[PDB]
């Protein structure tokens, strides 16, 4: 925003927003898998108790 | 005098304040396009060489 005109900076800014945003989406998906695996372990632990 | 194509002259600029408005004054500068920066934002940037 300090070097490029607003007519063209939209293209530059757009290709970077999606990339950062897409990286967050991957991280959330990984947590869901890990949470699912832990939930299975907890049920096994509860049965043991 | 301007030198030939194969003998382009290289010039040094250092330690001075640059105003690009005086560049815009001359009429026949009908070919003025820049890649790395927007032409209208040259008045609030600093360079090293």
From Swiss-Prot, chain A:
Top-level taxon of origin: Viruses
Outcome of mutating residue 47 to I: In strain: Gamma/P.1
Function: Subunit of the fusion protein that is processed upon entry into the host cell. Mediates fusion of the virion and cellular membranes by functioning as a class I viral fusion protein. Contains a viral fusion peptide that is unmasked after S2 cleavage. This cleavage can occur at the cell membrane by host TMPRSS2 or during endocytosis by host CSTL. In either case, this triggers an extensive and irreversible conformational change that leads to fusion of the viral envelope with the cellular cytoplasmic membrane, releasing viral genomic RNA into the host cell cytoplasm.
Protein name, as recorded: Spike protein S2'
Organism of origin: Severe acute respiratory syndrome coronavirus 2 (2019-nCoV)
Organism placement in taxonomy: Viruses, Riboviria, Orthornavirae, Pisuviricota, Pisoniviricetes
Swiss-Prot record, chain B:
Recorded consequence of changing residue 1 to T: In strain: Omicron/BQ.1.1, Omicron/XBB.1.5, Omicron/EG.5.1
Domain of life, per lineage: Viruses
Quaternary structure note: Binds to host ACE2. RBD also interacts with the N-linked glycan on 'Asn-90' of ACE2. Cleavage of S generates a polybasic C-terminal sequence on S1 that binds to host Neuropilin-1 (NRP1) and Neuropilin-2 (NRP2) receptors. Interacts with host integrin alpha-5/beta-1 (ITGA5:ITGB1) and with ACE2 in complex with integrin alpha-5/beta-1 (ITGA5:ITGB1). May interact via cytoplasmic c-terminus with M protein. May interact (via N-terminus) with host bilirubin and biliverdin, thereby preventing antibody binding to the SARS-CoV-2 spike NTD via an allosteric mechanism.
Entry function: Attaches the virion to the cell membrane by interacting with host receptor, initiating the infection. The major receptor is host ACE2. When S2/S2' has been cleaved, binding to the receptor triggers direct fusion at the cell membrane. When S2/S2' has not been cleaved, binding to the receptor results in internalization of the virus by endocytosis using host TFRC and GRM2 and leading to fusion of the virion membrane with the host endosomal membrane. Alternatively, may use NRP1/NRP2 and integrin as entry receptors.
Protein name: Spike protein S1
Full-sequence portion shown in this chain: 346 to 394 of 1273
